[PDB]
């Protein structure tokens, strides 16, 4: 796995573990579930790019300890 | 203290601090409390071994930044 | 940003990111929000000192990976 | 004080002065009062984030001549 941080605009940083070729939708759904949030209300970006349902960390060239931003 | 990660099957990683000779039941109860989960519904393992109420990190030979798995 | 840990007496460690000259009240309010807790019920300390509304990490001489204690 | 602009979707830009640790609710109420508008009908955002009653310009990392958006 690689470790990723999910950072909210409030400064919250939540941690996930994901394999490099696993879709990030696994993480996004988990984050929504754990944070009591809805995919209706939030969106995720990496390095300014929206993350789509089938994007994987490897396709987005993410590395251990990288941060995904939530808006 | 040593720092331990508690990893869910959804990829969530939550962090705890615990002293080496303190029972891990301290951590398990805290995790359930913070995650809104019940000891009825989940169980914790380290390196494939179930964690019992009085097991300590030292008895289970845990080290800083080790991961406990939740199922 | 610098990364700060917020540690509860139950051993929970939650992570925040904050800029050095931004008031820590940003973090305290976020922690309360994310943890479902109230500023009525809890207080935050760093190195034994209460944290006030306008105190910044730089004024309190905090560094990356320092811990704020909640009581 | 810092100077802030409040921009409507019609392109109107109205100016306020506020101290960095004063809640922005001071400004929001003033804007509603001066513009003949109601907090029922409008909401304020900064950099895509909703502004809450006790948020201060310092907590939201606002600077002189920044713009708050009204919707």
What ranges make up the beta strands (E) of B1-65?
A: 2-7, 12-18, 44-46, 49-50
The 3-state secondary structure of chain D, one letter per residue? CEEEEEECCCCCEEEEEECCCCCCHHHHHHHHHHHCCCCCCCCEEECCEECCCCCCCCCCCCCCCEEEEEC
Residues B49, B60: contact at Cβ < 8 Å?
yes
Question: What's the number of CA atoms in the CB half-sphere (13 Å) around residue C6?
Answer: 24
Rg (CA), chain D: 11
Q: State which approach was used to obtain the coordinates.
A: X-ray
* Residues of the domain holding C37: 1-71
Chain C interface with D: residues with Cβ < 8 Å: 19, 22-23, 25-26, 29, 53-54
Q: CATH code at A63? A: 3.10.20.90
CA dist., res. C39 & res. B37, Å (int): 24
Question: Chain B closest CA to A65's CA: distance in Å?
Answer: 13
Q: Tell me B68's DSSP state.
A: E
Instruction: Tell me, in Å, the resolution of the deposited structure.
Output: 1.6
Please give the span between the terminal C-alpha atoms of chain C, in angstroms, as a whole number: 25
Residues of D in Cβ contact (< 8 Å) with C53: 21
- Contact call for residues C15 and C4 (beta carbons, < 8 A): yes
Closest CA to A63 of A47, A44, A39: A47
Q: Chain C: give the shortest CA distance to residue D43, in Å.
A: 20
HSE at residue D7, side-chain half, CA atoms within 13 A, is 11
Of the partner residues B8, B11, B35, the one whose CB lies closest to the CB of residue A18:
B11
Looking at the 3D structure of chain D, how many domains does it have? 1
């Amino acid at each position: 796995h690689i470790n990723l941080k999910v950072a909210g605009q409030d400064g919250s940083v939540v941690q996930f573990k994901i394999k490099r070729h696993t879709p990030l939708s696994k993480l996004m759904k988990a984050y929504c579930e754990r944070q009591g949030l809805s995919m209706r209300q939030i969106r995720f970006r990496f390095d300014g790019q929206p993350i789509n349902e089938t994007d994987t960390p490897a396709q987005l060239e993410m590395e251990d300890e990288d941060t995904i931003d939530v808006f």
